[PDB]
Paper text:
The ATP-binding domain (residues 1–314) has a fold characteristic of ATP-grasp enzymes. The ATP-grasp fold is comprised of two α/β domains that simultaneously bind an ATP molecule between them. Notably, in the absence of ADP, the ATP-grasp domain is largely disordered and in the absence of RIF, regions of the RIF-BD are disordered. The polyphosphate moiety of ATP is positioned by a subset of amino acids, with Arg117 and Thr136 implicated in binding the α-phosphate, an observed interaction between Mg2+ and the α-β phosphodiester oxygen and coordination of the tri-phosphate by Lys22. Finally, in the RPH-Lm·Mg2+·ADP structure, Glu297 appears to be coordinating the catalytic Mg2+ ion. However, replacement of this residue for Ala had no effect on RIF resistance in vivo and the mutant enzyme was catalytically competent towards both reactions in the ATP-grasp and the RIF-BD. Since Mg2+ ought to be tightly bound to ATP, these results reveal that Mg2+ coordination by Glu297 is not necessary for catalysis. In our RPH-Lm structures, the β-phosphate of ADP and the phosphate on RIF-P are 49 Å apart, implying a significant conformational movement involved in RPH-Lm catalytic activity.
Residue numbers in the entry: 2 to 52, 56 to 66, 78 to 120, 131 to 164, 174 to 413, 433 to 494, 509 to 637, 649 to 865
Write the structure that this text describes.
Amino acid sequence: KPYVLKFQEIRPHSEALVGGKGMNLGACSNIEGVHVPAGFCLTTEAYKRTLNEFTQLLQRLSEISETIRTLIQHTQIPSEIASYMDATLLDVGGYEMPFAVRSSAAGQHDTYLNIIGKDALLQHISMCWASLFTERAIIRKVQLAVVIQQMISPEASGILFTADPITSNRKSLSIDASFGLGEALVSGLVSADSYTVRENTITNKIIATKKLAIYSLKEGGTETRILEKSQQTKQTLTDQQIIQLAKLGRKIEAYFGKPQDIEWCLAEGAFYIVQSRPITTLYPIPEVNEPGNRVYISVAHQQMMTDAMKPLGLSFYLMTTPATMYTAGGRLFVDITQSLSAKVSRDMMVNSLGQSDPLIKDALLTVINKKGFLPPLPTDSSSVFELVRNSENSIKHLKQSIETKSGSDLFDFIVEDLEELKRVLFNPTSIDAIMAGMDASNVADKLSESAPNNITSQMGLELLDVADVIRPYPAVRAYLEQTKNPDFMNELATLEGGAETKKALEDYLQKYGMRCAGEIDLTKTRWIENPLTLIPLILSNIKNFDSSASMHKFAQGEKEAFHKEQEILRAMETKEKIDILRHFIGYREYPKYGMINRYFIYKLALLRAGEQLVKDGILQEHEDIYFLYFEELREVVRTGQVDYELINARKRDFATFEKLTPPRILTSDGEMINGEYKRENLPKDAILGLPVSSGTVEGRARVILEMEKADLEDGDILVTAYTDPSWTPAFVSIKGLVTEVGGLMTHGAVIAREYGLPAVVGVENATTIIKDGQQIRINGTEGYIEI
Ligand SMILES: Nc1ncnc2c1ncn2[C@@H]1O[C@H](COP(=O)(O)OP(=O)(O)O)[C@@H](O)[C@H]1O
Ligand SMILES: [Mg+2]
C-alpha cells in the first residue's frame, strides 16, 4: 500500500502492486553477485488515486480511445505522488541522470529508454498509462505499474536463454548478442549473433551482419551506423565474455529454480541485468527416481497419437499396458536406457523399430553417439468368428455388471476387469490369428483388397450407407448446418425423413459410436456423446454421392481383386493362402475395437460416479474427474474430500500441454530428439516424409485437426496430425494424405493404396508449414507445395 516501491524493498509475490516485470527486478536485486541497475516501481495504487472523470468511459464498453488516452495524458499527477517520486528518484541518481521508463502489467505495453528531466519523465509515465488504450492493448479494469531504473549505455546487449529454445536441452545455453541498446518494439533491423554454451565451452557461434545499432544519444535514442567490418569481424562478445555471461546466467537459474529468460547489457566490461523471466515453452521432464542419464521413447509416436492426454486418460493406458511407462506433458514414454547400455540389446532395438521409420532409427543413433550421455560399453483358420463372438460375449457381461455396481467397489470392479481386458487383448490365440495373416504375405496388397469382416472398413462404408438413406429427404440439411447444438438428434422426428435417418444414425452409433479421434484417451469425447462431430463427413458424403456408394467402392475392390486372382493362375498352393489372408486380416483391427469398447463402458460408469460427486457436494462440475489419476479418484470417492487447486493446476497444465508436440526421443535433460530425413537428388524446396502409397497428384490442401472442420470437397488433400481408424471414413472424399506421424501399415496406409490415394506420413510440423488453402503436390516419395 505504498505509492512507490524500491527494487530491494519489493515484497514477494505481490505482483498486483508492482507487476510481473517489477517483481522480477525486485527478485534479481537480492541475488548476490549480480548487478541490477538501481531503480523503483510506481505502485499500481498511484495509477488509481491519479483517477472521478476517468470512469466515464470504462462503462461504455463494459475505437475512440483516443480521447480517454489523451485524458490520462492531460490528467496531472497529484503533488504527493509526485513528491514521493522526487524522493526515491533522488536516491538512485536524481534528475540530470538518465532513466528507463518501463511498464509492468502477458502482452506488451510502451517502454521508453533514456529520458532525462522531471517534466520528461512525468510525461512518459502518463504515456505508459496511455499504452493501456491503444487499439492493440484493447482486445475490463486492470492496474498498470511503471519501472524507473538507471539507464545503461552499453557497448553490447541482448537476450539469454538458460535452455536451448529449440532442442529444449537444459544443459545448453543460448545467447543472442548485439551491439548497442535493446528494442522495445523489436524490428528485424538490429540483427544479433548467436552463441551456444554447454558448460564452460563454446559449442556454436553464429556471427551476423550487424549494420545498425542503437545508441542513447544525450537524450533519446539515435540509431547510428557501424563501419562495414565492425559488423562482420567483431564478435559482439569475446570468447571469455560469453563464458562469463553463461555462468552469470545459471546463477540466476539456480536462484529461481527454473530455466530463465534473461535480458542483459554490457557496459565497460561489466554486465547488467534488466529483466528475467521463467521459460514456459519447454517440454517437461518425466519424474523418475534413479539418477543416471535417461533416454525415453515416445509411446505417442508408436501409437500414431500425438495429442495431449488428460490424467484419467493417461491412467487407463498405463493400466492397459504391461510395460512400465512414464508421463510427461500429457504423453507417455518408455525408458529404454537399460537396453541401450548393452550392445546385444542396443542393435536388437535399432533394427526392430528402424526401417519402420528412419526418424526413430536416426533419433536412436543420435542419442547413442552423443557426448558421453550414455555409458560406454565394457570390454488355424476356423479361429476368427469365435474370437469375435467371445469378444461380444465379454462386452455384454461387463455392461450389465457395471450398472450393477457403484461407489467404492466400482473401482474395485474396474481394476479386476482390466485384467480380463488384458487376457482378451494379449490372448495368444488372438495374436496367433493375425500372425497367420501377416505371414501370408507389392503383389500381395491389391490382392487383399475389399476383405469382409473388417470393423473399421464397415464403419467407413456404413457411413456411406447412412449417407444414402439420409439423402432423398432434402428436408433434412438446413437444420444441420447452423446447429451449434449437440442434441440435434431430438428434432429429427419433427421433420420428415429425420425419423428414418435417426434409426439409421442410431444403429450406426450402436456399432461405431464408441469410437472417436484418439480413442486411446478414454476421457476424449466419443461419437455417441457428441454426434455433431460426424456432421461434416456425412454432409461431405452427401455433397458428392450415389444411391449406394458403399456397394460400388466396395464392388470396385473385389473385381480388381478379381483380375489379379489369376494373372498369377495361368501353383494352387497360393489360392487359399490368399484367403486365409483375405478372410483373416479384417480381424487385425478388432482387438483395437474390443479394447476401446471396454473404455467407453468404464467411462459411463465413471462419469455417473462423478455425477454422484457433484450431488454429494464434492465436485464442482461433471467432467472434472478427467484431471484426476485413477488411484486419486478412488480416494476422493472413499473420502469425500478433494484438492481443486490441484484440479485447476491439472487444467492449466493440460492447456499448456496442448501447445506442445511430443518428441520421438526425450532425454533426462529435456532435449527433444526427432529424426531427420536423408536427402539429395530431391528438390531444394521439398518437405520430406515417409512414402506410404504409390502415386503422384496435386490439389488443394485442407489442414484439418478436429473431425469437425472436416469440410471435404472433391479434389482436396487432407493434412492433419494423425490418421486414426476413426479418420478412415474421410478417405472417400480426398485425393491425397499428409500426416505428421504415421506408419507404412496403419489402416489409413492400407486403404490409401486400395483407393489409389498417394499418401505421405512422418512429416514434422506439416500442420504448421502447409497453410490451409494452398495448392500442394504429393508423390509417393516426397511432396512439396505449389505457389
Ligand atoms: N535500464 C536499462 N538500461 C539499458 N537498457 C535497458 C534498460 N531497461 C530496458 N532496457 C532494454 O530495453 C529493451 C526493452 O525492454 P522492455 O521494453 O522493458 O521489455 P518489454 O518490451 O517486455 O516491456 C530490453 O531488451 C533491454 O535491453
Ligand atoms: Mg523485456
